[PDB]
């Protein structure tokens, strides 16, 4: 019952990263619940364009923290092999709690 959470910033980076876990998990493991989206949490920033004083300016910035999940039930010592040190994404953070 390996719970795999995938939090990131780029949705393609995670898609792949997430797919990479989907692939080598069915080859050595068993029955995977597939990759699931959350939600996704945004961090808006309402700043004034000009540095001087023009309230009516304002540029709008966001920051999307995408969340992906992949569940693996019936965790074998063989599954943990492919999914041991066979990663590649950089702007992706993973944490496991089983």
């Amino acid at each position: 019952k390996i719970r795999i959470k995938l939090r990131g910033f780029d949705h393609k980076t995670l898609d792949a990263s997430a797919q990479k876990i989907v692939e080598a998990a069915r080859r050595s493991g068993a029955q995977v619940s597939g990759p699931i989206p959350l939600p996704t949490r945004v961090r808006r920033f309402t700043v004034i364009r000009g540095p001087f004083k023009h309230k009516d300016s304002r540029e709008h910035f966001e920051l999307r923290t995408h969340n992906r999940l992949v569940d693996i039930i019936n965790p074998n010592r063989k599954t943990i092999e492919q999914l041991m040190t066979l990663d590649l994404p950089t702007g992706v953070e993973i944490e496991i709690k089983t």
């Binding site: 910033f9 364009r49 920051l63």
Partner: protein, 60 residues
């Protein structure tokens, strides 16, 4: 920002209330976002060059 107050606002005060923010970059004090710790001007500045990760330009 006067050095006399950047480096100053950094040394621990005798009262915890006294401790305010400044922008790590510009030294501004008026409106820094905690999240990045940069002067609203500054935020934009880098936001643009692409130096703040995941930080894109909103559109809806």
């Amino acid at each position: 920002a006067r050095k006399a107050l950047i480096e100053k606002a950094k040394r621990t005060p005798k009262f915890k209330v006294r401790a305010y923010t400044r922008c790590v970059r510009c030294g501004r004090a008026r409106s820094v976002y905690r999240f990045f710790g940069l002067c609203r001007i500054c935020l934009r500045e880098l936001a643009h060059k692409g130096q703040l990760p995941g930080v894109r330009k909103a559109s809806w």
